[PDB]
Amino acid sequence: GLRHTFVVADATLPDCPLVYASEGFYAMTGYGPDEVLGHNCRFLQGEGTDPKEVQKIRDAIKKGEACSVRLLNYRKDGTPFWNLLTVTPIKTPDGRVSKFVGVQVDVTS
Ligand SMILES: *[C@@]12=NC3=[C]C([C])=C([C])[C]=C3N([C][C]([O])[C]([O])[C]([O])[C]OP([O])([O])=O)C1=NC(=O)[N]C2=O
């Protein structure tokens, strides 16, 4: 299929820290696990990131809904790329959100 990356965020912590990332994510972004795990995904954002889209994900996470936004992100070396990003809430049987899982596709084409 298409080249994509995958992460898991822990929603049982107040600021959805990332707890797992596929090989592709580290390779796409240039950041290592020591700089990715424990942190919130937003460190990939920068000057040109549309705050109206950042808002759509903030709201969707607060409400525990899925969400798909297209964000401008930056690699560790500062070069930008276009991140088509899809967040999925993972609920426990009691209805609580336990994790958010994300598929991120570099759609710079
Ligand atoms: C990021 N991917 C990503 C993956 C998951 C599973 C989740 C839950 C979030 C992201 N983000 C966004 C970030 O964590 C945050 O949710 C939003 O920026 C909005 O909240 P704030 O407090 O910042 O307004 C991702 N952000 C990226 O920029 N790139 C991704 O790959």
Helix share of residues? 10-25%
Integer-rounded radius of gyration: 13 Å
Number of DSSP E strands: 5
Share of β-strand residues: 35-45%
Fold-level CATH name: Beta-Lactamase
N-C termini distance: 15 Å
The CATH architecture classification is 2-Layer Sandwich
Number of domains: 1
Overall geometry: globular
- What structural class do helix, strand and pairing data support? alpha+beta
| Count of runs of 4 or more consecutive helical residues | 3
Strand and helix map with partners:
Elements: E1 5-10, E2 18-21, H1 23-29, H2 33-36, H3 51-62, E3 67-74, E4 80-91, E5 97-106
Antiparallel strand pairs: 1-2, 1-5, 3-4, 4-5
Bound molecules: flavin mononucleotide.
Residues 7, 9, 16, 40-42, 44-45, 54, 57-58, 61, 71, 73, 83, 85, 87, 100-102, 104 line the site of flavin mononucleotide.
Protein name: Phototropin
Binding site for FMN: 40-45, 58, 73, 83, 104
Subcellular location: Membrane
